[PDB]
Structure formats: structure tokens, C-alpha cells
Design a protein around this nucleic acid. Structure first.
Length: 271
RNA sequence: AGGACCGAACCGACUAAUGUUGAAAAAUUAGCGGAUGACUUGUGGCUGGGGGUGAAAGGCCAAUCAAACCGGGAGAUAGCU
RNA sequence: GCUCGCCGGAAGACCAAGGGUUCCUGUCCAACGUUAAUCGGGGCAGGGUGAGUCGACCCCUAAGGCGAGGCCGAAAGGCGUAGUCGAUGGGAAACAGGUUAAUAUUCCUGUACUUGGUGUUACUGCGAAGGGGGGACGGAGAAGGCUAUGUUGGCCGGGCGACGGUUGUCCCGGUUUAAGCGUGUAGGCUGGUUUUCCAGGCAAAUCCGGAAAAUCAAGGCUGAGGCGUGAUGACGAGGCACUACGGUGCUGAAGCAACAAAUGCCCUGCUUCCAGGAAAAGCCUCUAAGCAUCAGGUAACAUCAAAUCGUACCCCAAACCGACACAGGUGGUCAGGUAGAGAAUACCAAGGCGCUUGAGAGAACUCGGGUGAAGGAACUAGGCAAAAUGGUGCCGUAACUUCGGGAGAAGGCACGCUGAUAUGUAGGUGAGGUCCCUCGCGGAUGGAGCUGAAAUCAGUCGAAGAUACCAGCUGGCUGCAACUGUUUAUUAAAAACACAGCACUGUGCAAACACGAAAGUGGACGUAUACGGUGUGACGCCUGCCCGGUGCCGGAAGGUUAAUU
RNA sequence: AAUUCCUUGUCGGGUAAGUUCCGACCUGCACGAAUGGCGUAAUGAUGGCCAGGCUGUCUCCACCCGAGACUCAGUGAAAUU
RNA sequence: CUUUAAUGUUUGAUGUUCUAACGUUGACCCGUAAUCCGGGUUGCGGACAGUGUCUGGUGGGUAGUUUGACUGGGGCGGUCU
């Protein structure tokens, strides 16, 4: 739910929280936990490869099952849980055989509801079926791109994919980015939209909030002496050159897609 | 409840005087700021020189930084002293 | 040796790190000590560090490192699998007292305990590089229940006062006692027991998980403290003989209660919040492959073993880092008394010091401070500095405002001591006693004693009652930046850098991008409500005209145009 | 105007007297709308200005307490030449 | 030997399709009590992609260098036969 904190302090006038009581107010399922130590934007060589990353709050990894290959065995939702490693919330489900697993939580899922995977599953939100058996004009999430590896698209808070057509062993999709992609007509997809849609209306409010997320401050570059950045310096605020990345790339329109390996599944890239 | 309030430890270093072959190759005294947090601290670890890191000052990288230090090319070259 | 003065959340005591004999004793004084030196952290010699329980080694791992093969790479070599190292973390066990010139939870006395090996006996399904469980973990807040400890009283011993008073509501001191064993409370959590079935846990499983029934509601786990035991002991103020006044054997009284009470224990708890909170082993269970009048397991007793290294001393400092016996720097632990909100401040206790040149004189001038006639910022670049303000409670409190603030706005009154209300109140604590009982560390009743505010009235001293130390100057107009923050270690803390927010743009995942000759890694065990880059910089009303130029994104008819031919 | 050369712009405010400050005027040498424009409560060891209190800051110094200076003893440097 | 159409042959351009090269940071099995690697099976792509040699364009991202002299100081201007 949406709620705006009160201006009891400078640092709360603009903070906005996304609260939800349905989430489990307790410890998570340990057997599905894994240590996730932070890196800091560095690599095996120790060099900062991705800037603006460091610190943040400790996190343990919740092993999520994006494949959903347990077919013909229904599961009941035990409880909704909070996962820091992603924006959407997850759901601990209990299979009839006694095995529990985590999944992404669709829009209107609850605790106690049932879901089933496979080719003979029902057409309801939260179910997983190969897109071959999904009608056209439907809406799915956690879409696979190659059969067997697991969902890779529409995994975020409120991201959904819409199926537009089915030509052969392929199907055409419009992703949340407006792009029009095609994938094999056997890649499993999960019905419904990921439910955290109020995650975008959130407001951190203060700088320290972004630092809890493991984010580090962003220094522009215009105040970065010429040795450090192309924009560099100058007496005052000159900036009389083209906007450019560090390492010299435009950043203001220049397209940088150079795959040329797929180059078949793209139809309506965007805009 | 709070990057909330006063204020010690703790962390800093705004003003002044002293000191300036100093007690000290940046301190002392008197006041000053933050003080549940983008806080602070111990231990150990990673990043190596046209590179690192940098809430960015051309700042820091062993009292040394507009390209560290040791050795070597090297008895560089010096129409200048 | 008698005094004086200083620290006393240390300038005291115990450690890590680091140093490595500076420790103790004897002896010496050239040099070292900023002076002398009989002294010394100096020289010389001798002596000193005693562990099954402390720590390390050892078992388990974190970040990370190395890395058989392997992948990649002109060579060197780089990345990395299985694995192996790696604490700053997890993992069995000792307390008190006494003792040496110098060591001790290490020696001695007493009382305990833990993990293993072997053997006898009795009863036996044992077994893993595997499965599960557990270990296992955040921040803040909230009390309650205890203790450490302290105060008073009582008890015991001593004392009757260098000057008035002092046999009394007088004065001084002591009033300590552990681990462990046993008891299982305050209290926290969880519903238990039995039978059957099952796509799960890489196969199996009596374990875990899941489903279905009957049957009982009481079963259990965890748990500070207290009590008892340990303890007819030990220690003990002080005695009595030795007594070189350097010191020894024996003896040694009381050894209770109440109140207050922690930041520490119950508490790895409870409650609540988002930023959602290590791993692995030991340990508890499950069985497989396997072994069965075996081997092995369990239980009791018995016996043996528990090695090796460190252990002195300093450790906010003269012993470590600073070239010095240097106003510096240095992590953790113990945290008394009076007043106080307090770990501030003042004065003190234990204890430890007076800072390794002194003596005198009492000029200018300098430094650090104290007071000041009248005037009161006339000083000065500038109220620089200094002076001033300063506490609790009550009344009261502006424009403006994002309605939270502004605000401790401003400003005003009252603060002592004594007595009474009340021979010490309200409150808090709570014994005996009575009653109850599942007879217990119980519940109720009961209120002794202890403890003790705050206010009112009255009276009273002083120039002055927040009397010391401690301890906001205030207000008004205004620029810039929203704010908290960050920065030029060592002349610049700012209007700069960050910032939440906004926008443009790129990126469909083997993502863009970045580090890399490459492999590969990061981004991310993420997937456009995401990530990267750029600029702007809370919020609020808004963000206008121009695509010629440069760049970017697109597009076509033609022209020009590389290697090649 | 953190931007205004001319310039102490002009008027008014405040002062006995105000190149600074405040508020208006516009002739903006050379503001201007996310290298953002105009406002903005709160905040700030921020810049500037005016008041009350306060004072040895000053008129104008005076006296006093201590540490040095001075003298004796012991030890015993330095820049410079 | 001036000339043009169905075939054979030839190479060259486009188009559709296939799989055997190649790719696979898809699935499963084994080495193997191993998310590396390799092998195998299968699927998806598929002669594209990608790499090598050559070549055009772009290229302060990174380098090595240049940027004169006279001169009533230098610069500016002017001059240099």
C-alpha cells in the first residue's frame, strides 16, 4: 500500500513507503537460502568495472525456481515473502509431495491459492505452461527464451508480456520495453503480471536510503578535471563539448547494439 | 519513529593566541562541529604507476604525486652557469 | 620516616598488538640520564617464565589466496574445477585460598570437571565423502525480574579523646567465603501421543517434509537468580611465644538483616520496523553400500593418557609507532564514595605520582591570567579577542510556514536553611502472623520495619540561595545553497562535491558497459517498475522561440570512392 | 545582481554624517529559463548589514598573581663567518 | 564467318530450402561424491555469426612532436627578398 510519512524531520518530507502486511513477518525458509557476499562493482582482477556500487545492507540469496518444471503436481501458496535481491515479492509454495519452493508473486496471488505447472495446467494467473498452449492476446511473466534454462523476461515488480501471434514453432511477444521479439513456441511462461506495481511509486526520500541499497554516490564528470573525464573542468561551468561517456562515447542517442548473432527475432525494436 | 534535539566518550578540525633552530618535520591551550548513523573502530584481505582509487580537491597511493619508490639504460643531453 | 600537594572513566589495575630480558637480586659510575648521583629501563654477574582445563597448535570455515587436471596466452605467465590453506568468527573441560625477592586458574592445600584409548561385565542393529535437523546470527525500542556493588542498621572487637564538650541516638575498624554438585523458580517458546498411506529430500531411510484419523489435554525444551551443599573447612580484625623488628608456628571473636541498584545477567528473549540480517564442522538423527554366535554401538565400573610451544616485564607508555627517557599517536577489559540527570564537573577512596637541573632576585619586555574609576565599539578591514548569556519548574511566547516547525523564540516570577502539615507525608519495598493447597522457590490476606520524594504554611541568616566547578547572548533585514552529510592529511570546509527528486539516452540478456592480447570476471546468480551513462539538483508556479552550424538517429535516386579484378 | 564598465547610478530608508546593507526605478557596458529561471519554511562553525546587552577593543592605560627575562652554580647548542 | 532461340557445359548475382562445417553463457548422461573442462546424445540456430590477412572510413580514446625571429623589456601591431 501507499503511505506518505510526515515531515517530522528533514529527510522524511518526501520519503514514501511501500508497505504490505500480507508479507511474512518472520524468518524465511533456510533450506532455500544461499550466501550472497557483495562485490562492490569489482572483478576477479580487483578493478572497478561497474561504478556507483558498494556497501549496502547484508543480504542472503533466496533460491528461486524460474523453470517451474514440476508438472502435474499442484502447489498451494503458503505465504508471501519479501526478497531483497529483487523488486518483486516471492511466494513460498507447498507441493502435494511435500517439497517447498520459491516463485515470483503474480498480481492477484494470495496465501492458500493453488497453482499448477505443465501442459495440462489450467488457464489461471500463477500457472506455468509452454506458450504453445497459451491463447493469443494473453499476458504472462517470467518468460523463457530457450526451453529448459528458465524464465529470463518480465521478472521485475510489475513487468508483464503480451503474446501477439504464433507463426510456427515461434511466438511473437511485445515486451514491456515496446520491443517486439519472437521466441520458440515451447518456452514456458507464467500467467499474470508480477505483483508489486506500487514499487514504482516508492520514494527513497534521503540520500542514506540509496546507500542502504548498496548504491554509491554518482559524481558527474563536468567537475572532474580534464585528466579524469572528457568533460573535465574549466574556469566555472563551461562544458562546451558534446556529451560523452568516460572512455569517449556519445551517450545521447548513439546506438551501441552490435550483436548481429540473433538479428532475426527483433521486429519493432522500440519507438 | 527519526541521515531528529542538547550533550560526554569517540570521530572530526571553524576562530584566536602561543610555538615557528618549536614539547611536536602541523602540535598545545581556550572555545567550536557531528555524536543511532551516508557513523565510528580493531583485525585480515583486494585493487600497482599513464595505472589504481577518488560524495572530485588534480586529492591520496608509506613525512615524496600534473604521473610513487628502488635499480638499470646513464658518465642521458645541457649552444647555459 | 613525619607532613604538603597532584591524578582518581586516571596520571589507577588487567591484556591484545608490538617490543623481546627492559623483570628480581648483588655489584659498579667512565660513557648513557639534557645538572650532581651513592640511584636508574645504564654497565657486569647471577637468578627468574612450572598448565589435561588460560592462549596457540589442533577440528570447521569467511573475505580472499594458491591451485592437480583443465581453459587461455609470443615466452614469462593469466583465470579457475576438484581440492588445499586462510580468523578478525564457531568448536570438550577449574574454582577458592595460600605461597616466591622475582611465576602461577600453571607450584602447594582443598574441592571439582572434560575428551579420548584399553579391559571386564551386562544389554544390543551397527555402519557414509551421503539425506535431514541443529549450529544460525539484523536495527531500534520496551519494561519487568535479578545480581555485581553500595548505603544504613545490627553483631563482634577496640577506644573514651594534646583545647570547651564527649558512657552516648558517641568514634574507628571488621562483618568475606568460589567453581562444581543438587534443587529447576521469575519467565520465554511450542499443543502433545499413537497408527496408516505418499509423484518430495540425486538411490534408500523408522529421519525431515506432506496428507489423512482416532485419542488426551498436560507433555516437554530453554531459563538468570535464589536456596541448599561445597564449608565442623578457608580467610579473618586482633592475640600469644619466637621476635636480626627483614619476619615465623599456634590461636583467632562477630561473620546477620534491610534498602537502593546498574550500560552488566535472564536476553541468541519479548515487541516493533525495513534497509530483510555469514558459512562450515563438532553435535543430534536417518539409513545405503557393507559386516552379523563377529566386528562395532549403548550403560556402569576400572585403568591409562591428555603431548608440544607461549607464560618474565612494559603495554594510553621513558620499554610499542614518532631519530630523543619527545606536552603527540595507540584497540579491548575492570568502572568505588559525596553532590549530580550523568562514564560531565568538583572534592575524595583503593592505588599510583609530584613530570632528572636547582638556588635567589622580584627591572624593561614577552607569554598565561585576575581587578578596574567615568564613558561603553568612539577600536578595527571586520565587535578579532574578551566580556556577557548559562540550570530546574511555572506563566508566556511573533512574522512566516511545506502546518512538522519557527521555539529553549522573545520575556517574566519563584529557587537557601529550620519547623510543621506528616515526632519521615504521598509513593516504593515488604517480615512475622493468619488463611488456602495440586503441601511448593506457592497464592491470598496482612501490614511491622526499611526507604523516601514534591508541594503548602510559618519562621530565619546573608550584599547576594541555579551561591563554587558545571552550564544557550538574543533579536531584525538579506545573498547563496534545500536539508544531514563529503573535500584540498600539512595555509582554502565554501556559494564547490554528494544528495533525494526530474529528465534525455543506451541496453531483450551470451544486455549495454567496463577490467582483460585471450580465457574469463564484474554488471547479476539481476531481466526495461532493470541496469549503465549524461546533465539537472528538495519542494512550489514554470521551463519559451531557432535544426542554419557541429554531433547523434534515420533515408534514398544519383554522383564520387578502397583492397580486389 | 556572486553578473552594472560608466558608478559612491538616482530616489527613499536607517546614521548628526552610510562607496557597505535594505527597498524601489530601468539606461540589463555584459540576467534569462534543467551547463535551469523565479520563489522557498526549516537548516548552516556560510557572506554582508543593522539593534539591545556586554565589556580594558578603545579613549588611556594602572595595579596585582604566576611562568620566562635578570644574577649565582652545573651541563652546554645553532644559523652565520 | 554479319543473326537469334529451347537444351548441354560454364562460372557469376539474388531468392527458397536443407545439414554435415561452425556456434551454443539450452536439456540430459558419463568422466565424477565437480554449476570448471572435455566427451556423448538431443534440440535450437546455421554456412549467417565469429575469427585471421588485406583494405576504406571514423578515431585527442592513447601517444610522440611542432607552434619562428627582429623588437628602445616581452606581447600586440609592423617588418623579413
Amino acid at each position: 500500500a501507499v503511505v506518505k510519512c510526515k515531515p517530522t524531520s528533514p529527510g522524511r518530507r518526501h520519503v514514501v513507503k511501500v508497505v504490505n502486511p500480507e508479507l511474512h513477518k518472520g524468518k524465511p525458509f533456510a533450506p532455500l537460502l544461499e550466501k550472497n557476499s557483495k562485490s562492490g562493482g569489482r572483478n576477479n582482477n580487483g578493478r572497478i568495472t561497474t561504478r556507483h556500487i558498494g556497501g549496502g545492507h547484508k543480504q542472503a540469496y533466496r533460491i528461486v525456481d524460474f523453470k517451474r518444471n514440476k508438472d502435474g503436481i499442484p502447489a498451494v501458496v503458503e505465504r508471501l515473502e519479501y526478497d531483497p535481491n529483487r523488486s518483486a515479492n516471492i511466494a513460498l509454495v507447498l507441493y502435494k509431495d511435500g517439497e517447498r519452493r520459491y516463485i515470483l508473486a503474480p498480481k492477484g496471488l494470495k496465501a492458500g491459492d493453488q497453482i499448477q505447472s505443465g501442459v495440462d495446467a489450467a488457464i489461471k494467473p500463477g500457472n506455468t505452461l509452454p506458450m504453445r498452449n497459451i491463447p493469443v492476446g494473453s499476458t504472462v511473466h517470467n518468460v523463457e527464451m530457450k526451453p529448459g534454462k528458465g524464465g529470463q523476461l518480465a521478472r521485475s515488480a510489475g513487468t508483464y508480456v503480451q503474446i501477439v501471434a504464433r507463426d510456427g514453432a515461434y511466438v511473437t511477444l511485445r515486451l514491456r520495453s515496446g520491443e517486439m521479439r519472437k521466441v520458440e513456441a515451447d518456452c514456458r511462461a507464467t500467467l499474470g503480471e508480477v505483483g508489486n506495481a506500487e514499487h514504482m511509486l516508492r520514494v527513497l526520500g534521503k540520500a542514506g536510503a540509496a546507500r542502504w541499497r548498496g548504491v554509491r554516490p554518482t559524481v558527474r564528470g563536468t567537475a572532474m578535471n580534464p585528466v579524469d573525464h572528457p568533460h573535465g573542468g574549466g574556469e566555472g561551468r563551461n562544458f562546451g563539448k558534446h556529451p560523452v561517456t568516460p572512455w569517449g562515447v556519445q551517450t545521447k542517442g548513439k546506438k551501441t547494439r552490435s550483436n548481429k548473432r540473433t538479428d532475426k527475432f527483433i521486429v519493432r525494436r522500440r519507438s
